[PDB]
Design a protein around this ligand. Structure first.
Ligand SMILES: O=C(Cn1nnc2ccccc21)N(Cc1ccsc1)c1ccc(-c2cn[nH]c2)cc1
Ligand SMILES: O=C(Cn1nnc2ccccc21)N(Cc1ccsc1)c1ccc(-c2cn[nH]c2)cc1
Lengths: 302, 302
């Protein structure tokens, strides 16, 4: 037993990280088959980033201006192209360490592992959720651009996130691996509104089930509620409205604990209206919304 | 910026995990050079674990009774021996993926990454601290025995922990890689007292510095304190006494933020005596003691 924020083992992704240098700037790239993916603002100077014309900036660059290093091995760039906000550098060698992989665009409320990297070298790994407002709350310093987020299904790495920017509020924004930003952000140094965030209700419920599985049961009570009544409470406390799709996803956890989803919603309602009264749940004095129902079942099944 | 509980990249350890089977039981082993390390209770049956005589149990076993599999590749066991609570299986092939490594015995209050494994296959990675009472609060299911904890220094993996047991309280106990348990525990199914735990004061202070570096400053106040006055408060709230050795370790964080350690102790004192008053620090409504001063500087330096 026990329940912790657990990242996927990062080995399959470590073998893909390279450093990408274009004149001045160095960041991280992702080497899969004979293509290296990295953020396109690698072609910018610091001044360029206020109103960069990426098309013109890229026209000034040839294959030989992109220096790509995988540890010590030097890659020979034989093609370059821009897709949305990513650069794709064709190299003449397929990465011998390429895992089975897919590119996926994840939904808000889903989680993934981030392998934070600097100069192409892995630094650490941690779990993140895509916030309802399409930001993530990560740990990224200067030089971390091009670090990627991923999930692993059996042997297949599904890459979902590439890191591009820190907003002045301190939260992080990035793209899928086709270079499309999550949310309304653009790769320009302007102030950008991250919209209203909300708490991921179905994840808080999955986490309450995780807590019951691991012995924390004090929040279980005598009450029940209805989808509509609960959604009134969710609205007041800025939680995502709960839907029948959410109820269905929580079915296995309902089945394994024998606690009906709506009875668990009644517990969450009480916690929202009265707080925790100084107690803790799975080591936290806040309601945790960064575990998906799948995250709970995976960690509670092995 | 941002600050998260960050594990080391697990790739160098993934290449070392094997499964070890001895008659009935299967668990994880660690393959380094031509030796595989695993918990000795792999030689037990379920009934054996109440009062196991490991010496006699091991005498019944020959090299060929230990089946060792590294993914699909079968290892040929050419020797076996017991060192304290670990088995060392000599195999005829050096692990080609052996990283540079050391075996270390860590001190309480130090942190490390755990690569949780089942049947020799990696499941996830997360940070743990060795509690003052030599337990760890992990996430381990049946079959996770032999999973290891480690730190990585540049290219060198320092292995510090091998997982052996879950206590009836739900916390976890294990050995160093010489097979010596941390704390008073033994590899028998008896009830065992984990002594009084305490909060790791120097880690809470390092985490408060991490918070200031990343914008959370509301707990900073007008007050100061002394080592002795603060230690009166630590005693009342079951915190480790603070020493000058701790003050010195916090020197770089003091220097980078310009907040004297004793002024930060004055903030911690106020938090302990009054609580947080519903506010949060780095996303937490509790005082966090699982980041060492080195963990803060590493994550805040790259
Ligand atoms: O946000 C960044 C880069 N970034 N990402 N995570 C960070 C954590 C700490 C500090 C900086 C961090 N920006 C701003 C921008 C606006 C639109 S996209 C990115 C950034 C700043 C400078 C460059 C640059 C490229 N060449 N020279 C400088 C790139 C991105
Ligand atoms: O605690 C364990 C094994 N273990 N470790 N983490 C666990 C998380 C969930 C469930 C079990 C877990 N024990 C008890 C014991 C007491 C002294 S050392 C270990 C355990 C139980 C059974 C065996 C066994 C060996 N052969 N057959 C059964 C081994 C350890």
């Amino acid at each position: 037993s026990g329940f912790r924020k657990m990242a996927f083992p990062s080995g399959k992704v470590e073998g893909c990280m390279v450093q990408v240098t274009c004149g001045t700037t160095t960041l991280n790239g992702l080497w899969l088959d004979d293509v290296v993916y990295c953020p396109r603002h690698v072609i910018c100077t610091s001044e360029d980033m206020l109103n960069p014309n990426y098309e013109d900036l890229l026209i000034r660059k040839s294959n030989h201006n992109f220096l790509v290093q995988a540890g010590n091995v030097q890659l020979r760039v034989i093609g370059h192209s821009m897709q949305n906000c990513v650069l794709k550098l064709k190299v003449d060698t397929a990465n011998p360490k390429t895992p089975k992989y897919k590119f996926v665009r994840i939904q808000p409320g889903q989680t993934f592992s981030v392998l934070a990297c600097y100069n192409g070298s892995p630094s650490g790994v941690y779990q993140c959720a895509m916030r309802p407002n399409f930001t993530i709350k990560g740990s990224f310093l200067n030089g971390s651009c091009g670090s990627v987020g991923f999930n692993i299904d059996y042997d297949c790495v599904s890459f979902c996130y590439m890191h591009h920017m820190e907003l002045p509020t301190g939260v992080h924004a990035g793209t899928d691996l086709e270079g499309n930003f999550y949310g309304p952000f653009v790769d320009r140094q302007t102030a950008q509104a991250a919209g209203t965030d909300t708490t991921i209700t179905v994840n808080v419920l999955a986490w309450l089930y995780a807590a019951v599985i691991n012995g924390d049961r004090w929040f279980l009570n005598r009450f029940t509620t209805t989808l509509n009544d609960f959604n009134l409470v969710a609205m007041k406390y800025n939680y995502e409205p709960l839907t029948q799709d959410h109820v269905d996803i929580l079915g296995p956890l309902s089945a394994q604990t024998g606690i009906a989803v709506l009875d668990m919603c009644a517990s969450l309602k009480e916690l929202l209206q009265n707080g925790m009264n100084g107690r803790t749940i799975l080591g936290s004095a806040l309601l945790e919304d960064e575990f998906t129902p799948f995250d709970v079942v995976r960690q509670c099944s092995g």
